[PDB]
């Protein structure tokens, strides 16, 4: 709302906060980003490294759903099981009725290894694993599987 703006408090002052010696002119330094290597070199060098030049190879058309690759850490696995089944499975550390989780059904492709796991056997199916993710899983009694 215009009642509370700073510009309305400058009526009666002649130059509206822009100074007398300088003043408010149109484009005293140019338009847009012009001058980046000339009179604005200091600004560009202080705050924008890697702005000029080329780097790396180019792909004329990126296939967006081929590069898609969601991931899940081994410490988020048990949150995919609802709470009631959660306590049921945790109570009985069964080796014949272990829970089976298929992360592809939840929207993930690869399993990474951040965090820790509860001490209880489990079966996890994915398309790929990290080196440590497999190691941590086998130390808790679980086994990893590859799913179509």
């Amino acid at each position: 709302p215009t009642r509370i703006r700073k510009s309305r408090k400058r009526r009666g002052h002649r130059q509206m906060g822009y100074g007398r010696v300088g003043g408010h002119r149109k484009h005293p330094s140019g338009r847009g980003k012009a001058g980046g290597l000339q009179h604005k070199r200091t600004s560009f060098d202080k705050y924008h490294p890697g702005y000029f030049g080329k780097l790396g190879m180019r792909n004329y058309h990126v296939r967006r759903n081929i590069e898609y690759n969601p991931t899940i850490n081994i410490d988020k696995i048990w949150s995919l099981i609802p709470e009631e089944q959660r306590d049921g499975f945790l109570q009985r550390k069964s080796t014949t009725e272990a829970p089976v989780v298929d992360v592809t059904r939840f929207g993930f492709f690869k399993v990474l290894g951040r965090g820790s796991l509860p001490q209880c056997p489990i079966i996890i199916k994915a398309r790929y694993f990290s080196s440590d993710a497999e190691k941590k899983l086998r130390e808790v009694g679980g086994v990893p599987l590859l799913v179509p």
Binding site: I66, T95, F129
Partner: protein, 202 residues
């Protein structure tokens, strides 16, 4: 020192002259009302046939949406043969037919044959000899004929011993071997020929 991220907005074009490139949305409520009125009139004109046709269940394309279904354009001729119907009859009783599409697996064929069987079980036909009253008793269906529903994933149970038999004891080595197989063979071939230079010169 000003530290900002640079803008990525294009300058405006044709602002005081040329084609009108500004779209306003002051007619949104009126457009809503108009579309509803058209729908109601059309539904009245064909009572008791539903506004929509029965359409197949298909899979979403890329790898990102691989495991879910949506509504497609029309049933293929193999599915109709599965239910023993012709394109003319199918179009007569309100079924959409798409002879451009080809099935790529038998699971799709089975799913859509089941869909057709359900629809045929639930459809009723009125003859030109039926009295006007019983036609008035009919109910006109609303919306999509039989929506596609995707269930949420569930948790099943298995045996650790059985699963331990299906993978090697070092799965990461196994995976990394399969990923690098093509590039490792290229190095080997280039190395063998590099050896032929050793013997060919002597």
């Amino acid at each position: 020192g000003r530290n900002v991220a640079f803008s990525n907005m294009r300058r405006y074009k044709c602002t005081n002259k040329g084609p009108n490139l500004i779209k306003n949305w002051f007619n949104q409520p009126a457009r809503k009302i108009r579309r509803r009125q058209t729908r109601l009139q059309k539904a009245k004109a064909i009572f008791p046939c539903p506004l929509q046709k029965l359409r197949p269940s298909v899979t979403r394309c890329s790898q990102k949406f691989n495991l879910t279904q949506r509504i497609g354009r029309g049933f293929t001729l193999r599915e109709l043969q599965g239910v023993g119907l012709s394109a003319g009859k199918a179009r007569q009783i309100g079924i959409a037919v798409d002879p451009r599409r080809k099935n790529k697996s038998e699971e799709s064929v089975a799913r859509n044959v089941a869909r057709l069987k359900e629809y045929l079980s639930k459809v009723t036909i009125f003859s030109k000899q039926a009295k006007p009253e019983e036609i008035q008793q009919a109910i006109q269906h609303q919306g999509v004929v039989m929506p596609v529903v995707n269930p949420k994933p569930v948790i099943t149970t298995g045996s650790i011993a059985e699963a331990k038999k299906e993978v090697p004891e070092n799965l990461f080595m196994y995976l990394r071997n399969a990923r690098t197989a093509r590039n490792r063979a290229r190095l080997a071939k280039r190395d063998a020929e590099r050896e032929a230079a050793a013997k060919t010169k002597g």
